[PDB]
């Protein structure tokens, strides 16, 4: 069985971008969907859309990358330089609203899951709530 679907999705994306794949499919789950909504909304991916692979529902994540570069290693700079699962099973991480970090001195995001929905660290701070620290993206 898949042990942690979210780490699996984070990683599907990580690997996918490391070889500069146009898209990548991840098994559909509402919570995953709500994550991809934050990635999209924050400009980390081009977007996502629901799809059916051999009858089973998935999410096509369309990733984005920077400009093709100069002399050797023309490979573009990454948009998602770093994706890390934080609160995994068997070691859970919940933060109060004053425990919510500042990711990359501002330039990254910390996806929280709050009782008021899946927020970024900014969204969840200005909403005045904390919750489970899902992952760093930056």
């Amino acid at each position: 069985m898949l042990t942690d679907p979210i780490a699996d999705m984070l990683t599907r994306i990580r690997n996918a971008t490391r070889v500069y794949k146009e898209s990548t499919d991840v098994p559909a789950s509402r919570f995953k969907e709500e994550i991809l909504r934050i990635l999209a909304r924050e400009g980390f991916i081009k977007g996502y859309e629901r799809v059916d692979v051999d009858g089973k529902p998935y999410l096509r994540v369309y990733l984005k990358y920077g400009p093709r570069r100069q002399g050797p290693d023309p490979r573009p700079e990454q948009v998602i330089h770093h994706i890390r699962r934080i609160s995994k099973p068997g070691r859970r991480v919940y933060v109060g609203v004053k425990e919510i970090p500042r990711v990359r001195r501002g330039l990254g995001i910390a996806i929280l899951s709050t009782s008021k929905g899946v927020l970024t660290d900014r969204e969840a701070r200005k909403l005045g709530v904390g919750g489970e620290l899902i992952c760093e993206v930056w």
Binding site: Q70, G71, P72, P74
Partner: protein, 234 residues
């Protein structure tokens, strides 16, 4: 300055030694050979020749580099048809990064030529006469096209970025843009402006380079007759 029906020559190459990164330019596998997508080629050809005309009518130098036994004489003639320097016999380690040092060898070439046009050739002993004889011979073997490079080229044209990758490494490193004729065995990521097609098969190389030089001279307004290289087809 274009072509459409050139599907009559250049369809595909390289049965199954492909670079997977070339997959974006492949049409299908017909009779166990990779056939290159025809329309894709002309797309990359527009984007490549645009850069060519721009760089040409600006006045830039282009290094034409090809060592394939298929492309030797073609590179020679088409590079002479333009005012561009070429590399024909062997691409030497450092021709770009050691360009100073390699340039010193062209100074020796010119020096021995000018001492061979002077009456002093027989002023020196018979044995040194044979020695310097050999020096001029091989110098004029390797640097016959590299001769006229005064500074580092503003562009590079290669006919197999796989076999000539030692050059592309140096053009990359010094940030010189790289134009390439690359078939299915090549890594397209390293080529800045690519023309996908057979690196082998003289028939198509003569077309591609002839048209390219034509566009070159058309940028500067020196309109030229058909290329003398068509008689190298047979």
């Amino acid at each position: 300055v274009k072509e459409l029906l050139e599907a009559g020559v250049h369809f595909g190459h390289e049965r199954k030694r492909w670079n997977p990164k070339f997959a974006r330019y492949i049409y299908a596998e017909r009779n166990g050979i990779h056939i290159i997508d025809l329309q894709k080629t002309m797309e990359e050809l527009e984007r490549t020749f645009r850069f060519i005309e721009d760089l040409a009518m600006r006045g830039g130098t282009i290094l034409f580099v090809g060592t394939k036994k298929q492309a030797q004489d073609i590179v020679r003639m088409e590079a002479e048809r333009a005012g561009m320097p070429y590399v024909n016999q062997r691409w030497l380690g450092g021709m770009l990064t050691n360009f100073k040092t390699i340039s010193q060898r062209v100074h020796r070439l010119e020096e021995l030529e000018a001492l061979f046009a002077s009456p002093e050739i027989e002023e020196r002993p018979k044995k040194e006469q044979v020695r310097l004889k050999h020096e001029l011979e091989r110098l004029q073997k390797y640097l016959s096209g590299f001769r006229l490079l005064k500074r580092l080229p503003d562009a590079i044209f290669v006919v197999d970025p796989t076999k000539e990758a030692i050059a592309v490494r140096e053009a990359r490193k010094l940030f010189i843009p790289v134009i390439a004729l690359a078939d299915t065995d090549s890594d397209p990521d390293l080529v800045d402006y690519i023309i996908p097609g057979n690196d082998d098969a003289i028939r198509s190389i003569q077309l591609i380079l002839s048209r390219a030089v034509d566009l070159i001279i058309q940028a500067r307004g020196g309109v030229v007759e058909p290329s003398p290289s068509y008689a190298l087809v047979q």
